[PDB]
Design an enzyme around this catalytic site. Structure first.
Site, PDB file in Angstrom:
ATOM      1  CG  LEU B  18      -1.980  -1.089   1.266  1.00 52.52           C
ATOM      2  CD1 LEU B  18      -2.635  -1.111   2.634  1.00 52.52           C
ATOM      3  CD2 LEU B  18      -3.024  -0.919   0.166  1.00 52.52           C
ATOM      4  N   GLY B  19       0.344   2.321  -0.574  1.00 47.82           N
ATOM      5  CA  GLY B  19       1.141   3.516  -0.714  1.00 47.82           C
ATOM      6  C   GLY B  19       2.269   3.286  -1.705  1.00 47.82           C
ATOM      7  CB  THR B  22       4.346   7.692   1.015  1.00 44.88           C
ATOM      8  OG1 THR B  22       3.536   6.796   0.244  1.00 44.88           O
ATOM      9  CG2 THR B  22       4.911   8.756   0.098  1.00 44.88           C
ATOM     10  CE1 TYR B  23       0.499   6.687   3.552  1.00 45.96           C
ATOM     11  CE2 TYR B  23      -0.520   4.799   2.493  1.00 45.96           C
ATOM     12  CZ  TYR B  23      -0.543   6.134   2.833  1.00 45.96           C
ATOM     13  OH  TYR B  23      -1.612   6.918   2.449  1.00 45.96           O
ATOM     14  N   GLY B  24       6.034   2.961   3.808  1.00 44.91           N
ATOM     15  CA  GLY B  24       6.989   1.926   4.150  1.00 44.91           C
ATOM     16  C   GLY B  24       6.528   0.563   3.680  1.00 44.91           C
ATOM     17  CD  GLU B  25       8.458  -3.211   2.511  1.00 45.18           C
ATOM     18  OE1 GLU B  25       8.424  -4.421   2.194  1.00 45.18           O
ATOM     19  OE2 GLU B  25       8.328  -2.281   1.690  1.00 45.18           O
ATOM     20  CG  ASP B 130       5.020  12.366   7.688  1.00 47.56           C
ATOM     21  OD1 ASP B 130       5.022  13.458   7.079  1.00 47.56           O
ATOM     22  OD2 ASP B 130       5.368  11.288   7.153  1.00 47.56           O
TER      23      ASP B 130
END
Ligand code: A1APO
Ligand code: A1APO
Lengths: 289, 280
Positions: B18-19, B22-25, B130
């Protein structure tokens, strides 16, 4: 990696001698051609190991050219092992010394602070921050002269900043006070003044204030609203000028902590009679005590 | 508290990231037993868990309506997986990219719900750090929620007996306080009004440096026309330059823009309806 690194084996030029110090791999060495003594810091280095930190640390040391900072004699690279060659100091650090001699005299501490303040003023004039001023990083040579060493923490902070600076991405939502901490760091060179004040207490008492407190509890104590700077314990032992030197160096607000140049005018470090003779005395106590 | 010492792949089927970093894993996943969809976030560990359980307990002790739901956490091969509510519509940035610019009333409702989330986190001495459209989630119930990753560098510290108080402050918090979230929310409102934050096309570094100058002036809404005095004022005060003067989250909640009548989830369900039309 360094643009002036010697691409050859340092052992072709030096004879390795004993290993030095806890908190380093640092070696005493002798120039095969000149017989001069040096210190060689070896750090094994795979090609996959990131060079950023070691690159900045060498850079920080080579652009120094001051008596009160350990001299630099180039670096080597050979055989996946990096080596930093620098001035050797026969007596080691002040911590090595006072662990044997006991607490320094006020005049001895005064000389040490003056010499450290001289080195800090030079570092800060290059916009360098030491960030690890302490007894263990103030080296003493046989002549009784003072030199500042160990830029590892300074290099780590600079390396990560430049990395956080180009891994910044989208800081368009960032508040101004946060961006100032992103670009500049959140504190400035005056932290070295505070650390020197702590070191002065250390040389008087054989440990910094709160040394017996769990380090994590210390970080929280210093961030509390009502935190008060530490003080010398045995007040009667020391003059008012020494107490004042601690008070001013340990000013809690960095907007009011004097710079290195200003401190070099304080009464404690500007009094007459401050020379390496005071430390030759300390070293004789170390040998004959 | 339940941290599972289990492979989360035992319980869920991973489906897709997902993302976009920007969100990572972060992954959409399905519960193998039911059909329930969740979002699984992976965070790497060092061999360093005591404090971990403390932060987990807080995450499931939470039932604040503006924090994304927490279902559990898995520890497997030095990797921590946080299982959370899955929002089909994603973030507000996911939405307005298809929908377009939000309305002033919709922006006002978001600001109110985000402020409540922020007041909660700040009451726990957490800083979000953030706040922006991409990090404000909208579930199918029309709820505005923030993710609480406060759970998520002794190298900097080492031994602290010689360091100055300001160096210790940077080592702990990071050189600022929770009022940075209030600035980011002001920028977020403008993002929701114009589809970009101020200066999106300028180089990150440039923008960073311009803010440090003492000649810096906070940004403002692009088109003075489309917006009311309350919106403009909300921006002005959230984007207060000095953090010593920036209003807290609790205080901002009494501002006119987020107190006015008519703020209800209908504004966000309307937004999702418009989103549904754009995808057919
Ligand atoms: C402190 C540090 C931390 C981290 N990396 C390097 C050093 C460092 C750097 C230098 N340039 C040194 C120069 N000289 C000495 N001298 C002795 O250790 C005397 C006691 C031995 C005998 N005999 C030590 C030195 C340590
Ligand atoms: C904000 C954040 C920051 C950092 N790490 C994770 C998240 C985070 C946490 C959660 N609980 C999420 C739950 N759901 C979504 N949903 C989608 O992304 C829909 C549009 C995709 C499709 N299809 C994203 C989520 C992101």
């Amino acid at each position: 990696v360094d643009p002036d690194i010697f691409n050859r084996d340092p052992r072709d030029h030096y004879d390795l001698l004993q290993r030095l110090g806890g908190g380093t791999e640092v070696f005493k060495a002798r120039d095969k051609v000149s017989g001069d003594l040096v210190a060689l810091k070896m750090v094994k280095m795979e090609p996959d190991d990131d060079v950023s930190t070691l690159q900045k640390e060498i850079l920080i040391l080579k652009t120094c050219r001051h008596a009160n900072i350990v001299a630099y004699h180039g670096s080597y690279l050979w055989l996946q092992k990096l080596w930093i060659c620098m001035e050797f100091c026969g007596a080691g650090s002040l911590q090595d010394i006072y662990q044997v001699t006991g607490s320094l005299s006020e005049l001895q501490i005064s000389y040490v602070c003056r010499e450290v303040l001289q080195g800090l003023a030079y570092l800060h004039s290059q916009k360098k921050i030491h960030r690890d001023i302490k007894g263990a990083n103030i080296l003493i040579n046989d002549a009784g002269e003072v030199r500042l060493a160990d830029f590892g923490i300074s290099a780590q902070i600079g390396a990560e900043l430049a990395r956080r600076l180009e891994f910044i991405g989208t800081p368009y939502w960032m508040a101004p006070e946060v961006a100032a901490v992103a670009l500049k760091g959140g504190y400035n060179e005056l932290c070295d003044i505070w650390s020197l004040g702590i070191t002065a207490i250390e040389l008087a008492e054989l440990q910094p204030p709160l040394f017996d407190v769990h380090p994590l509890r210390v970080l929280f104590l210093m961030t509390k609203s009502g935190y008060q700077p530490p003080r010398l314990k045995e007040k009667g032992k020391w003059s008012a000028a020494f107490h004042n030197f601690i008070k001013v160096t340990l000013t809690k607000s960095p907007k009011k902590r004097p710079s290195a140049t200003k401190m070099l005018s304080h009464q404690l470090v500007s009094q007459p009679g401050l020379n390496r003779g005071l430390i030759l005395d300390l070293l004789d106590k170390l040998k004959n005590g």
